[PDB]
């Protein structure tokens, strides 16, 4: 630290409160301005778990945890270690959710880099303007898919910023290295257009040449101050914005996207665990998706990588899959369109054309189902039933967020499932007890499991692109740690108190995966991964800021 | 400003938040670190007023008000300039007092200068610290008797800074030269020496030569660093420091102690108003403190000044005022202590001793009972049906503090004596209604009505030292502005809501009478003392942090 | 000191160069950037003095020198300290003097404030961007009357730098507090404006109320900033706008002119010094003034009152008094313009008209003779052989400076009057050895004898305004230290080489004088005035910038 004196305090990356010790007050200015009791982070955790427990209402929770962040960044995370389970529903969904539809009513400091169309040509003076010299990673979004909120504009600021949290809560990613940005053409939201206290441009989307050369911009930008091996990830955009930069920048930039190739991985990871209490050939495996955009593509796509990684052909691995959305099953000469990606699991029409999702389930009779509609409970309880009686054991997966979004609730899928369904939701639910006397505790399928993990090793090896195959590898890394007994418990991923472990064990598995393929570039090539990875997490315990005094000889 | 980029932001003293124009941005670095949208301070006030709508209790809008100082300071004063008598409550009595209390659970920022006992012969130290040049105005404490709760040691910090919050919202006095400075020699409070988040020394206090030493090293300090002429209010010091503190320095220092001073002014000011109504001849005037400490002294000795300076001798006035502490009536030669300053109110034992302060009531037949006992509710309904009995219009000030100190409520006075009193308090109560339609709405004898507007003419006219004269004349400006018609409604003060012009005016007065009695150094002399004034009191509007830029010729 | 690392190294006011201590190195973040050779100040002032011994001309020893208060400050001050008398010529005049002639060509950093008639209506924005907050003086000049140079413009800014030099290493007035000023509002040099390194705008001088508007609003500014009472020392203005400055201002701010002033009361201390060895009744004493402007019109009005103090009355004195200025003789009806100043001293045509300052001498036969036209030699040999004749002891003031535009050198002097002159000088001579071996050692008559001394003193005793009184005590107090010894050498002066203690001698006067009169309105008073003055002497003596570090019981 260059700084001393009160700027120490004002700054939440270096501010301890009455953490500073006594020696570290005098050399540093301190002294005087902070109260004379020297307490430890153990203390100040304290107090903040004896304010939370008297908090009534989520939101509330929310804003003074995120402002902990503004004040006391070591606090902040050390809160969110002591339990991120319990402060997880908070801080991530379906919380942030309710955040960021608020964003211009709970403000009180900004946080991240917003980048406006207004902006256009003088991108990188806006990056210049940003503290922190030795950025690693950004999350960026432009607010178009909030979840299954839809167009929220800026006020999906929320989610970069929750997503970063993450980053660092869970793989120990530094704080200081991470970049929260929103790009702002305007919003079509029209509720926020005529919201006083909204916090972008009054205007509708920009959807011209203007939109992709401010995108192109910003990457340029970006990389140039920062380095080409900064990872870049995209969150929340619309579906067409989506595929089309993930596609454009793969190749050219450390980039992916996480609606599409993050919630890919950890559900297949989900499928993979399913497939310890089922066992059945993956050849009768039928998949059938509701909804078939950013997620369902992105599942999809992986799951043939592992059918054909096992034996299948594309081909052939394809076409045990199917796909539903919001005009009707996805056949070949529709009338409702159908995009690139959407083609390889788009088929003929079968005898009859299901009308609702429930017929489809029963003409189809799959024996997976996973929902990414955003649009509500859509796996009504005939869907439910339907899937009891054509399966022994029915995979559901209600993977919509946040929680008024889900396909059906935990409660809705076991009690009417007689128990027998492997059940996985994007958004928390906790353990169910049937009349019976059986409980079952329900693993969430979000992909909060697979980017922290993934980022992790793709900064420490220097990686330069992303390939699919690398979320295929951290499915793997995902499921190998479920152990038999956490199967029993109804769990198809490992539990969300282990996350933080989770992670990394997801990262060491993919820095092998990376050194071992070639696509790594941090010399020397450390002998043990395991080592190398759990060295360089960043860690939420205080750190002297006393200058280095010594006696000489 | 010497200062660019995020730390304008991270400086309350600096942060516009949104309010930053696009200029401002631009020219200092900011574009990109807060959203595109461009606010008001309009828009920020209506932000704040609809979450406090909100929210439940008192302490948790004090958390939130207060936390705003340590964001926007612009925005902290437009708060309370929007509704400062709603506020009131809630930054001051008797809200302020719960805040002490639980000062370490609440805790997020530090707020002043904090000095110990353990930095004895470093004080100048501690004081360089501060980052603000100009002080000019300093409300100290150590916390040992912090309004009527008793010894509260280093949670009494909330004073100081309460205090301060109110030298800006009602006098203008400039924020960044206002300075809350806390003494820190221990605490005897048992419950705060096992509290976990107590932040103090954990030690009972020192009351050897050491605090004197400290005391003493804190005034050239604070005077070395920033002038002789710097204003020093002692606040809430214990009542044997209090006096001998105010005695050893107000001819060396500019300095007063705002409970014995400032309550001596407020409360005479309530008795001036109350001849307004009364016109009873002083000869008929007998007053009885229940209570014979700082507040009670300092105001038996200005009444006492005023019927000199009306024409009666020291040793008559003298005679009307009596005093009941917690050992009884001060009667000469009692078995109870009676100190130098209580000895002029100590007079040779009635009749009969009063037991209780009811018969004290019934044998001395007061016409006025003023409570600064800080005990509870003494002035119980049967003291309070004496008053009403001796007196066709008893006089009645429960003006201890908070509330739940306070010697009887507004309620309960008025209905007691059907209407017949004249009351006033501490701490706030709403406007009473009896059974017969009457209305009575009283009036708060808080010294807040003082202590800003006398601070704003000692600064403003380089005052060297502070007599009790210039209370005096206080008291009488206070009361000058009093409207018959308020006077009407029960009121023997100005509406709390008109606090700042009513400082203003106290300002102006103090300063014509500062400069006529020639205790004003500040040259060339104003013209006219209120345009003076006026120009100089500091504004809650933003100010524009744009550079000078201009062509040249 | 808010600033640690590199930025302590780059300003020359706390860099120490290799005198940092081991553990200020270590607790201030420059381990590692300086040797590791801990030196003293001693070992700096060592080289320093090994490199000037090398050096050959004047001006490269200026610019090595002032150097080192771009670097150093403290060694800066230690070396003029090691040897004032050997540098004076140096730094002061007439060095100095050829130093402004090039500012331009030598300049390497800008010293002091720049403001420009292109700033009009900006002036305290510019005093605002002064880095240091607590000013106590200012020396002021818009270069129209650089030393008897002449019109320099901007190039004279080397002027105000020089006087605060002396301000510091005089009186030991601290460096961080002085502020030289440059008005730049044009020069009619007509070489400057055709010089590419000229550093001012390139138009004549703006003669018009503009000019006056921009004085007034740097007054104002300058004020306004730092206080009413700052102190404001006009240096080398025209002789128009001197006079009237001066007049306009002296009662409305702290502020005098040090070349009508300040030349007055050393002139008038040689004078009363050559009393010492002269005598002879004041009735006979008749001076001749080489000049009429600002200095010989100051010298004329502290002569008068010197004599007013004695018995003669004004009309009386200003009889003895007689001026000769570019057009001739001052005579009542001459053709030549007489102003308000010179009237007093404009008689009555003699005998006959000279034509001559030779012919004014025989025809008038002064006793004294003062030069202050800074137009070069024009006391000839025979002027002072005229004077040797019409005298025993000869009193000849050559004080026109620099040594070129002097009006006589002392060889001259001393060796055309056969050593029986009382000669003084504003530029250095070294001592003169006639041809019979008797030796005379010159005085140097210059306002640096006063200045340094009545700044202290004003700026100690808080002064406001400065009447000519203080001068005259000025005078008197620089005499009166003048021993018998030191008279019997030639010197009309205390010798140079103790300069420091000559200046704080004259404060510690100045000071009594100014409290004793009701001037002072620092309080309270000092009892001991000597000790008072001693004690705020700013030292050049390296100070310790260790944070207080320290065991807590
Ligand atoms: N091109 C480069 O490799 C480069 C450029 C500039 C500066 N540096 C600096 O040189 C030092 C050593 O380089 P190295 O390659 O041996 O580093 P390393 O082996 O420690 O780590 C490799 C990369 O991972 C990053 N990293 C490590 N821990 C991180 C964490 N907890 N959170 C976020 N990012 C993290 C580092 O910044 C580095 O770029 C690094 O500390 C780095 O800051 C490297
Ligand atoms: N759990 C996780 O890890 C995770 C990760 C990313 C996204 N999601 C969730 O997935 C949902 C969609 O995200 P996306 O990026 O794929 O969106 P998208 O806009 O790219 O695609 C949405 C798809 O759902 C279909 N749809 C809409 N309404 C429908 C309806 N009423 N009935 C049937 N189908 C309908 C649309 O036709 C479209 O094909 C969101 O709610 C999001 O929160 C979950
Ligand atoms: N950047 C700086 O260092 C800076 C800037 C502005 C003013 N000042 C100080 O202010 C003084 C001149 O002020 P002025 O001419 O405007 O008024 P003034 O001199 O008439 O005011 C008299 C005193 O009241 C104080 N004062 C005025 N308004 C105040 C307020 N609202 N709150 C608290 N204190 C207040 C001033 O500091 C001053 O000491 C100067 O002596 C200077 O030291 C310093
Ligand atoms: N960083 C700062 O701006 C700073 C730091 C320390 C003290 N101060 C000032 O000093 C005053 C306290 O009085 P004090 O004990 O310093 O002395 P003092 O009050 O006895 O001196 C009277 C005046 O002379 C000035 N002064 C003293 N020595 C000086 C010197 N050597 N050179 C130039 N000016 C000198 C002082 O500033 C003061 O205005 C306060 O009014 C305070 O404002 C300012
Ligand atoms: N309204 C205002 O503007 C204002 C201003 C300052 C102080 N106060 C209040 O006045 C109260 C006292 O403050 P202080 O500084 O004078 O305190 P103090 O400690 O100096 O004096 C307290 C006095 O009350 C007496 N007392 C205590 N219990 C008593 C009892 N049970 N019966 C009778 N007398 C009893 C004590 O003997 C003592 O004489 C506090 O509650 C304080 O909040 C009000
Ligand atoms: N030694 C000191 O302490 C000290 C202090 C201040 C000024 N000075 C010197 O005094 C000199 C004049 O300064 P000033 O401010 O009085 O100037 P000024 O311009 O106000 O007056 C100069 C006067 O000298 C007269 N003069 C010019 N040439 C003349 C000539 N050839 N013959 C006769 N008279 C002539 C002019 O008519 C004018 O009246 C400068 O050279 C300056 O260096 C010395
Ligand atoms: O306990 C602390 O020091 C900080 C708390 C907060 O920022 O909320
Ligand atoms: O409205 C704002 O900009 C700030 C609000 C806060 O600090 O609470
Ligand atoms: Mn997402
Ligand atoms: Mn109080
Ligand atoms: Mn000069």
Redesign the interface.
């Given at each position: 630290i260059?700084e001393?004196?009160?700027?120490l305090?004002?700054?939440p990356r270096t501010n301890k409160?009455?953490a500073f010790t006594?020696?570290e007050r005098?050399?540093?200015?301190?002294?005087?301005?902070?109260?004379?009791?020297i307490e430890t982070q153990d203390?100040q955790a304290?107090?903040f778990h004896?304010?939370l427990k008297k908090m009534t209402s989520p939101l509330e929770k929310y804003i003074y945890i995120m402002?902990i962040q503004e004040?006391n960044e070591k606090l902040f995370y050390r809160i969110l270690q002591d339990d991120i389970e319990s402060l997880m529903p908070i801080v991530y969904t379906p919380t942030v959710g309710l955040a960021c539809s608020q964003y211009?009513?709970?403000?009180?400091?900004?946080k991240g880099?917003?980048?406006?169309i207004?902006?256009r040509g003088?991108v990188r003076?806006?990056?210049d303007?940003?503290?922190e010299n030795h950025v690693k990673a950004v999350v960026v979004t432009d607010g178009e898919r909030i979840l299954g909120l839809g167009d929220l504009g800026?006020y999906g600021?929320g989610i970069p910023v929750g997503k970063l949290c993450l980053y660092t809560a869970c793989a120990g990613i530094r704080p200081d290295r991470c970049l929260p940005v929103?790009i702002?053409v305007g919003t079509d939201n029209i509720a926020l257009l005529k919201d006083?206290?909204?916090?972008?441009?009054y205007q509708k989307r920009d959807r011209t040449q203007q939109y992709d050369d401010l995108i192109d911009e910003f990457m340029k930008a970006i990389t140039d101050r920062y380095g080409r091996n900064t990872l870049i990830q995209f969150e929340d955009f619309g579906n067409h914005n989506a595929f089309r930069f993930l596609r454009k920048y793969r190749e050219k930039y450390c980039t992916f996207n996480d609606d599409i190739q993050g919630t890919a991985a950890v559900a297949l990871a989900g499928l993979l665990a399913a497939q310890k209490v089922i066992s059945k050939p993956i050849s009768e495996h039928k998949i059938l998706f509701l909804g078939a955009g950013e997620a369902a593509l992105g599942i999809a796509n992986l799951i043939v990588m592992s059918m054909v990684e096992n034996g299948l052909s594309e081909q052939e691995a394809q076409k045990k899959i199917w796909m539903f959305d919001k005009y009707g099953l996805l056949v070949k000469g529709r009338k409702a369109k159908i995009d690139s990606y959407q083609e390889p699991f788009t088929h003929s029409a079968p005898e009859s054309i299901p009308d609702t999702f429930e017929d489809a389930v029963n003409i189809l009779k799959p024996s997976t189902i996973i929902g990414v509609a955003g649009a509500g409970r859509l796996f009504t309880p005939d869907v439910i039933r339907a899937m009891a009686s054509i399966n022994e054991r029915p995979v559901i997966f209600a993977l919509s967020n946040p929680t008024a979004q889900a396909e059906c609730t935990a409660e809705e899928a076991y009690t009417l499932t007689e128990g027998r369904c492997l059940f996985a939701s994007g958004s928390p639910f906790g353990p169910v007890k049937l009349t019976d006397g059986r409980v079952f505790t329900p693993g969430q399928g979000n992909n909060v499991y697979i980017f922290p993990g993934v980022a992790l090793a793709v900064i420490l090896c220097n990686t330069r692109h992303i390939s699919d195959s690398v979320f295929l590898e951290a499915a793997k890394a995902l499921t190998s740690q479920l152990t038999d007994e956490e199967l029993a418990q109804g769990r198809l991923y490992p539990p969300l108190a282990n996350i933080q472990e989770v992670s990394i064990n997801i990262a060491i598995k993919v820095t092998e995966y990376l050194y071992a393929n070639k696509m790594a570039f941090r010399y020397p090539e450390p002998e043990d991964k395991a080592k190398y990875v759990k060295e360089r997490t960043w860690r939420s315990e205080y750190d002297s800021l006393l200058?280095?005094?010594?006696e000489?000889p």
């Open positions: 260059k001393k004196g009160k700027p305090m004002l700054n409160g009455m006594l020696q005098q050399m540093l200015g301190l002294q005087g301005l902070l109260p004379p009791k203390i304290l107090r004896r304010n402002g004040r211009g009513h709970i403000f009180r400091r900004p880099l917003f980048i406006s207004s902006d003088h003076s806006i990056v303007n940003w503290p800026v600021m929103c702002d006083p206290f909204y916090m972008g441009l200058p280095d005094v010594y000489w």
